[PDB]
Amino acid sequence: RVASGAGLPTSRQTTIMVTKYSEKSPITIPFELSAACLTYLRETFEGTI
Amino acid sequence: ANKTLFKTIDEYLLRAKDCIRGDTDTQYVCVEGTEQLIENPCRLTQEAL
């Protein structure tokens, strides 16, 4: 604020209030895995190269 | 208003400045709320534009 020699009042209340919010925007990404790729991934038949 | 030219200058700034109530929707005479005065060169020159 600023002091003044004018007769107009200046604010008696330093520091104004401010309300704010935390607007969440979640995201989601599917990614498929074929059941074949999984069943071959863990298992090892050891039958051929 | 008749004066020596320097006294007309001191009247031109100390006194001649207008005080319209410009904050309101339409023109009004001064509140005496010590809002800034408005200089009027035409009042001294007496020449409307």
Curated annotation (Swiss-Prot), chain A:
Q: Which species is this UniProt entry from?
A: Human cytomegalovirus (strain AD169)
What does the subunit comment say?
Homomultimer. Makes the hexons and eleven out of twelve pentons. Interacts with triplex proteins 1/TRX1 and 2/TRX2; adjacent capsomers are linked together in groups of three by triplexes, heterotrimeric complexes composed of one molecule of TRX1 and two molecules of TRX2. Interacts with scaffold protein; this interaction allows efficient MCP transport to the host nucleus. Interacts with capsid vertex component 2/CVC2. Interacts with the small capsomere-interacting protein/SCP.
Instruction: State the family it belongs to.
Output: Belongs to the herpesviridae major capsid protein family.
Compartments in which it is found: Virion; Host nucleus
Tell me the stretch of the parent sequence this chain holds.
Answer: 99 to 147 of 1370
Q: Summarize the protein's role.
A: Self-assembles to form an icosahedral capsid with a T=16 symmetry, about 200 nm in diameter, and consisting of 150 hexons and 12 pentons (total of 162 capsomers). Hexons form the edges and faces of the capsid and are each composed of six MCP molecules. In contrast, one penton is found at each of the 12 vertices. Eleven of the pentons are MCP pentamers, while the last vertex is occupied by the portal complex.
* The protein, known as: Major capsid protein
